[PDB]
Amino acid sequence: PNDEATIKALDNVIKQIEALSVIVNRSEKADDAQILGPNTYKQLLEHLFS
């Protein structure tokens, strides 16, 4: 056996495992709530007589 291929294979598999073990899962999504604004009731036309 060529002892220099085993070392390279071990290094490669160790690098793969180390790379796979650093990935993090973090999400910073917003919320579905809607910001509300001010409003004023409007007046419908009316007629007054006595």
Binding site: P1, D3, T6, I7, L10
Partner: protein, 50 residues
């Protein structure tokens, strides 16, 4: 190839070397520049022995 390897084909000596060195790593942490845990506190109490 898997059957060929299982039938008495010996592993590269480094396997046992790493297994034996990992035990050394556990027993003396600060020789390899790592600490298991840290304590954050506002009123520290010194260890008199040191």
């Amino acid at each position: 190839l898997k059957q060929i390897a299982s039938d008495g084909q010996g592993a590269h000596p480094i396997a046992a070397a790493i297994d034996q060195l990992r035990t050394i790593v556990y027993r003396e942490p600060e020789r390899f520049g790592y600490i298991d845990s840290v304590i954050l506190t506002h009123n520290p109490d010194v260890d008199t022995a040191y």
